[PDB]
């Protein structure tokens, strides 16, 4: 039960932070830009069982964009992604739409604002439409607040399952182990945890 | 007559507590974020045993599941007074047992120093 | 006249 | 081993390929990984595309094709014009016949829909190129061959599909203005023969996978075809009826007919005003006989997302909206068009109760234009009156939360037109609706709330005695309801309601001051309860009647012995007791906003001072034993009370204002005193740790004092009236504290508030010291630029604050830039370009309108060594800097500004506002304008910078920019048109000739 995802946009748009963040939990604040495509397993607990996003994410500068719209041959769903603080990634949509629907001609697609953490937005809200013509379901995210960073795949895993009332539920969680650690590793450890100390925890003025 | 038409459930929950979960990445000297989400202590009915089980909001996914061991200890980051430290030999959120050393912050200083209270009490009950 | 009682009425609010 | 085919030495193994591309798309790993690599090293050789007639013909994998013919996308869009004519011609014949065998082929035609479409873009590529000046007969064979051939006529009409997106929707970025004319006015030319063929497919049936087809391309066609072509013929009546039965034509259709409601019509005709009703009637018709009636549920239907349900109706809500907004006056008068007028908005009513956001935003745009419509246009409202009745609930019991905020407003709107158009039946709705919350037949949380909010929006649209009556109602309606519910999770949701609406109503707390004042020491009493959220709500519904009522806190009220205002600042330590700093913060300045409209200075003054007697206490006390041991601002108590003191400053500052300088007077001379011995401590603290100190909650709380020290400052000379003391009182004893301590601190422990600080007092009272803003620029130019010069990521707030610093500079004390030694004006001009190659938007901006504003400061100076030593040492800097970014293709987002300046620069030279020669006497003989200069410079700069493009080409283009500076659109235009033939070899020098 695997479902191939490709994942498009302008470069710097944030679709590696965003997937980053699904698949370990971290917020990655460089920007590395992707080279070609990295394909990435993405695992969801269900009501209806595991659902699972092979997930293609594609390099949106044009220097680094490989293969291109052969990235998109048999995908089974897509996001396309656009930056509200930068309005030439939002006018880029049409174009990433159309190269991605003439290879996918009828699959779900959502279509993703991020980055609306950012105070000066300049893509505003009721200047996004260009989804509405085209069926394609709009969320406003954001990858460093995870604002509805959740909701693309939901939306997508009930279209692609065929279930409107699929809920994301949570995983058993096992007992865990016993602990028993050698003393020969008392002195390694104590290293590894002195220099965790003394580097500071990054963001210490958000809420959490 | 008219015929009509998780798996934790056999734990107590201790303590629970809004906090944001980090792990160190020795190899890039960079504390990376786990998860945000509520952080439980749970009391195994069975066996007495604590373990911290924690979870991300939305996705529901565990980014953290061990023993509350007895030979872990809490220690300070240097940049936070509403942060712990330790370091856990045996976590399985993501597949098999691995060790990390974990940070995690909370919303105040007050709810930090709480957590290391209910973490010390959840100790002892390890002992016995 | 029943803005008077309506104040009144308002003051009684209360939690417990 | 995978990595063979990359061996272009040897002859490509397409079982080798093969293999790659499959591990590639069906493989996973490291394996996949490696793949991939492989193929696009082999993609982007240059010669890969000699081998993809061998892949194509040789291959048996789908894939490998695919990327054979992107490989030839490569080299068609950008080295066509550079092939031997031959190559040509071969690459041509190869894609049609591949193309042509594809079609013949039934099995293939239908198992390998991807790789035909490919290979149709591949063959519209050749056709941008070739067609029709070297293809004229391509148009005519099309349809010659369509009629042998259900296949290969379904593929043309997939191959004009993509002709037509590719020379009229998406040819703007793409191409030239000439060449995109040129094709535009081919497809037009040939068009009649094009319309002939698919209206013969369309009207003789039968294969619907090549009627979807052509209905496909259809829909292309009417972005830009004339009307002509869907009025003078039957297709309307075909769309309209016969397409709209077939559930397979009927997604498609329907989009066409949306267009067709675009299209460009004359509004004199009886006749075309029939045939637009007539559709429309055929479309609904056929809604109700074989989809769906009027009366159907669309709420339940769309969540139950069977098929292509939700797409349908989104398509249906998108005509109907489209139509009725363009063409429901046509329906409006004749009495036989009445239940089709009605029957549409019924419609859009049930569409209107589907859980959808998205979709709810373009009914609620509809609603909007027609009540908007109903409110202004005479004899019209009484139509919709069972319309908007059902709208009433609709828009009621949908409504979002206020302050998204866009979907909040635009509910507003519409309900506040809708209310005008009938208040009784508006009142009645929200009144019965309030009824069915107090039964509990409807009572939720969300349904209350959702009830408070409608409630509260229509607020200012009933006349004061009717809303009098019907606040009163509600309130009395809504305690009820909160002295009903048990618990204090219920008795908050009720609370907060009612604390909701009366806020939403200050006409009436006005006219009411007992009332209002009841409120008031009710939300004093909510203050102290600890639950989670009253506090908070407490003290926003005090601040926003505070706002709008202001006013009957300062005078005396009748039976009152004083201005309220005086009761609550007497009693002021008692109701914040209990608060958070924050919502403190809010309270004093909420106190502030109604001691600015006490106009008697010396009054307004004693209330300040009172409001102001805790903060300054405890300032007073701190301010002593502060200077007898700083150790204590080591104290985190210490230093959290001091951080709030100031910032409880700069809450009642940012309500008053000028009023404010009396307190900022108390405090002034002192708090500068502060800020230097906590800047001492953070040094000391950061020598003795290292930069890690930096980090610790020690010092991020004394750096806290002096953020907010300075936000204090910049708040209140952002709002000052009288200049003269900002000047004379306040200006020295700020930079002696703040200036030097800035520049002497290791990067890391520099506050960038410094530079935002300083951007104000430029900004206010700049013009007034320009000793002090040369003084400014020495401190922070140089030492700020070397932190930001290394890459485009650190110090990200410095760097921004930096730029607007020396905007501002630029633009109200330039005489300070004049001042600098020359090495220093050099830096500037460095760092202005340096912001040019920013992506970072706040920056890039900046940089061009200073490099802008630079340029006119210039001007400005006329004829004088200055000036003329700046335009030899900097003009052809700016202009070549600022080219590099117009054509990098990283800095589009500043494409405009790019030009601007560009066209700036071009222009002083063809006016000769630049005296003395750019040039050498040397490289140039002498008396030669800097006109003909110019253009050697810039042809022989984009000669190396860009070496395809011919010589012909650059003089074309320059002669073209250069003519054309006094005309920013079409200067522009020449500039898209340059970086599309950079983009390729062999582009047309004429086509600069377009404006
Ligand atoms: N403030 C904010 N920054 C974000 C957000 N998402 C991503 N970023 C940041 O944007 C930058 C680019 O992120 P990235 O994932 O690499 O973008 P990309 O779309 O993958 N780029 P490419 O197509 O070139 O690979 C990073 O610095 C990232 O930290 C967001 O939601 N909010
Ligand atoms: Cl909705
Ligand atoms: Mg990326
Ligand atoms: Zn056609």
Redesign the pocket.
């Known amino acids: 039960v695997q479902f191939k995802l490709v994942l498009v946009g302008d470069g710097g748009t944030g679709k590696t932070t965003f997937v980053k963040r699904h698949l370990t939990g971290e917020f990655e604040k460089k920007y590395v830009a992707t080279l070609g495509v990295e394909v990435h397993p993405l695992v969801f607990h269900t009501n209806r069982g595991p659902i699972k996003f092979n997930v293609w994410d594609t390099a949106g500068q044009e220097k680094f964009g490989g293969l291109r719209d052969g990235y998109y041959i048999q995908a089974q769903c897509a996001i396309i992604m656009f930056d509200v603080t930068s309005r030439v990634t939002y006018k880029n949509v049409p174009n990433w739409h159309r190269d991605l629907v003439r290879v996918c001609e009828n699959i779900p697609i959502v279509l993703c604002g991020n980055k609306v953490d950012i105070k000066d937005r300049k893509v505003k809200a009721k200047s996004i439409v260009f989804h509405r013509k085209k069926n394609l379901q709009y969320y406003d995210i954001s990858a460093k607040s995870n604002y509805n960073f959740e909701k693309p795949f939901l939306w997508l895993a009930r279209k692609l399952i065929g279930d409107p009332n699929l809920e994301f539920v949570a995983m058993p969680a096992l007992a865990p182990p016993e602990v028993v650690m050698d003393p020969a590793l008392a002195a390694q450890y104590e290293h590894d945890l002195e220099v965790a100390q003394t580097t500071a925890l990054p963001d210490e003025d958000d809420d959490l | 007559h008219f015929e009509p038409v998780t798996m934790e459930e056999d734990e107590e929950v201790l303590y629970k507590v809004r906090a944001k979960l980090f792990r160190f990445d020795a190899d890039a000297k960079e504390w990376k974020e786990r998860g945000t989400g509520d952080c439980k202590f749970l009391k195994n009915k069975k066996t007495n045993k604590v373990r911290i089980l924690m979870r991300r909001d939305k996705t529901l996914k565990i980014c953290a599941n061990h023993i509350i061991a007895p030979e872990y200890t809490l220690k300070p980051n240097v940049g936070s007074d509403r942060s712990w430290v330790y370091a856990c030999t045996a976590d399985i959120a993501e597949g098999e047992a691995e060790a990390f050393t974990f940070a995690i912050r909370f919303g105040s200083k007050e709810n930090a120093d709480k957590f290391k209270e209910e973490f010390e009490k959840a100790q002892e009950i390890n002992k016995k | 006249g029943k803005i008077e009682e309506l104040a009144q009425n308002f003051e009684t609010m209360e939690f417990s | 081993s995978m990595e063979g085919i990359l061996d272009f030495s040897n002859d490509l193994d397409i079982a080798l390929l093969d293999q790659v591309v499959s591990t590639f798309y069906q493989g996973s790993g490291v394996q996949q990984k490696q793949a991939q690599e492989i193929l696009t090293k082999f993609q982007d050789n240059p010669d890969a595309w000699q081998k993809a007639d061998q892949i194509l013909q040789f291959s048996t994998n789908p894939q490998s094709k695919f990327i054979a013919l992107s490989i030839l996308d490569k080299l068609i869009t950008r080295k066509w014009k550079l092939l031997p004519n031959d190559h040509r011609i071969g690459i041509r014949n190869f894609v049609v016949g591949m193309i042509i065998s594809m079609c013949q082929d039934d099995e293939v035609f239908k198992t390998q829909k991807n790789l035909i479409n490919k290979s149709d873009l591949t063959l519209v590529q050749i056709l941008k190129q070739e067609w029709p000046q070297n293809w004229p007969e391509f148009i005519p064979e099309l349809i010659g061959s369509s009629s042998s051939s259900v296949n290969v006529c379904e593929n043309n009409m997939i191959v004009l599909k993509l002709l037509s997106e590719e020379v009229f929707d998406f040819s703007a970025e793409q191409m030239t203005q000439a060449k995109a004319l040129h094709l535009k006015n081919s497809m037009s030319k040939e068009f009649e023969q094009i319309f002939k063929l698919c209206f013969q497919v369309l009207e003789q049936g039968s294969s619907s996978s090549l009627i979807v087809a052509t209905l496909e391309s259809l829909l292309r066609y009417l972005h830009w075809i004339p009307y002509r072509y869907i009025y003078e013929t039957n297709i309307l009546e075909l769309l309209s009826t016969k397409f709209m039965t077939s559930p397979d034509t009927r997604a498609i259709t329907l989009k066409c007919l949306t267009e067709v409601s675009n299209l460009k019509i004359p509004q004199d005709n009886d006749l075309i005003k029939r045939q637009t009703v007539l559709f429309f009637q055929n479309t609904l018709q056929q809604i109700a006989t074989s989809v769906m009636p009027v009366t159907a549920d669309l709420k339940a239907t769309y969540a139950n997302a069977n098929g292509n349900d939700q797409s349908f109706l989104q398509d249906l809500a998108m005509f109907l909206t489209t139509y009725l907004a363009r063409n429901r006056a046509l329906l409006e008068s004749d009495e036989s068009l009445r239940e089709l007028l009605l029957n549409a908005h019924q419609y859009l009513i049930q569409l209107s109760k589907?859980?959808?956001?998205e979709?709810?935003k373009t009914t609620l745009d509809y609603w909007h234009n027609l009540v908007a419509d109903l409110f202004y246009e005479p004899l019209k409202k009484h139509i919709y009156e069972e319309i908007c009745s059902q709208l009433r609930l609709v828009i009621i019991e949908?409504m979002v939360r206020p302050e998204t905020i866009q979907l909040y407003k635009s509910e507003r709107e519409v309900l506040v037109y809708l209310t005008h158009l009938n208040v009784i039946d508006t009142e009645e709705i929200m009144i019965s609706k309030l009824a069915r919350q107090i039964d509990g037949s409807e009572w939720s949380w969300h349904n209350i709330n959702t009830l408070s909010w409608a409630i509260g929006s229509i607020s200012g649209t009933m006349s004061e005695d009717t809303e009098k009556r019907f606040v009163v109602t509600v309130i009395k309606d809504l305690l009820g309801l909160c002295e009903q519910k048990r618990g204090k999770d219920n008795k908050a949701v009720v609370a907060s309601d009612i604390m909701y609406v009366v806020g939403q109503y200050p006409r009436f707390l006005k006219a009411h001051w007992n009332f209002l004042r009841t409120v008031i020491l009710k939300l004093f009493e909510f203050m102290h309860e600890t639950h989670e959220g009253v506090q908070d709500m407490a003290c926003d519904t005090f601040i926003k009647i505070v706002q709008k009522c202001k006013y009957h806190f300062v005078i005396q009220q009748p039976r009152e012995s004083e201005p309220f205002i005086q009761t609550i600042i007497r009693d002021i330590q008692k109701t914040t007791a209990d608060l958070q700093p924050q919502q403190v913060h809010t309270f004093y300045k909420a106190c502030g906003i109604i001691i600015s409209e006490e106009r008697s200075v010396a009054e307004r003054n004693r209330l300040l001072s009172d409001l102001m007697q805790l903060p300054n206490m405890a300032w007073d006390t701190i301010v002593e034993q502060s200077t007898a041991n700083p150790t204590l601002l080591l104290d985190s108590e210490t230093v959290k009370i001091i951080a709030n003191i100031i910032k409880t400053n700069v809450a009642v500052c940012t309500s008053m204002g000028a009023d404010f300088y009396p307190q900022l007077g108390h405090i002034y001379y002192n708090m500068l005193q502060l800020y230097r011995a906590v800047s001492s401590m953070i040094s000391a603290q950061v020598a003795a740790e290292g930069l890690i100190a930096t980090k610790t909650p020690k010092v991020r709380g004394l750096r806290t004092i002096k953020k907010e020290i300075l936000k204090l400052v910049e708040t209140y000379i952002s709002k000052a009236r009288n200049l003269d003391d900002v000047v004379k009182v306040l200006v020295e004893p700020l930079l002696n504290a703040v200036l030097e301590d800035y520049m002497n601190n290791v990067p890391d422990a520099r506050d960038a508030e410094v530079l935002n600080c300083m951007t104000t007092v430029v900004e206010k009272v700049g013009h007034m010291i320009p000793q002090g803003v040369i003084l400014i620029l020495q401190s922070v130019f140089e030492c700020t630029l070397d932190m930001i010069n290394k890459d485009f990521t650190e110090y990200p707030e410095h760097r921004v604050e930096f730029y607007k610093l020396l905007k501002v500079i630029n633009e109200k004390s330039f005489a300070a830039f004049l001042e600098l030694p020359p090495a220093a004006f050099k830096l500037f001009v460095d760092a202005i370009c340096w912001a040019f190659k920013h992506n970072n938007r706040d920056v890039e901006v900046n940089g061009l309108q200073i490099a802008l504003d630079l340029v006119k400061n210039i001007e400005r100076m006329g004829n004088v060594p200055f000036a003329n030593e700046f335009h030899k040492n900097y003009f052809f800097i700016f202009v070549s800097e600022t080219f590099f970014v117009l054509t990098d293709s990283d800095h589009k987002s500043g494409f405009s500004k790019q030009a601007l300046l560009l066209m700036k620069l071009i222009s002083l030279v063809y006016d000769n506002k630049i005296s003395v020669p750019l040039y050498q006497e040397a490289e140039v003989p002498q008396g030669t304008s800097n006109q003909v200069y110019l253009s050697q410079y810039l042809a022989n700069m984009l000669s190396n910078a860009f070496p395809h493009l011919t010589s012909e080409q650059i003089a074309s283009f320059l002669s073209a920019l250069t003519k054309q500076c006094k005309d920013l659109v079409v200067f522009k235009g020449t500039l898209r048109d340059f970086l599309v033939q950079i983009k390729e070899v062999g582009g047309d020098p004429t086509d600069y000739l377009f404006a």
């Open positions: 589907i859980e959808e956001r979709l709810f949908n």
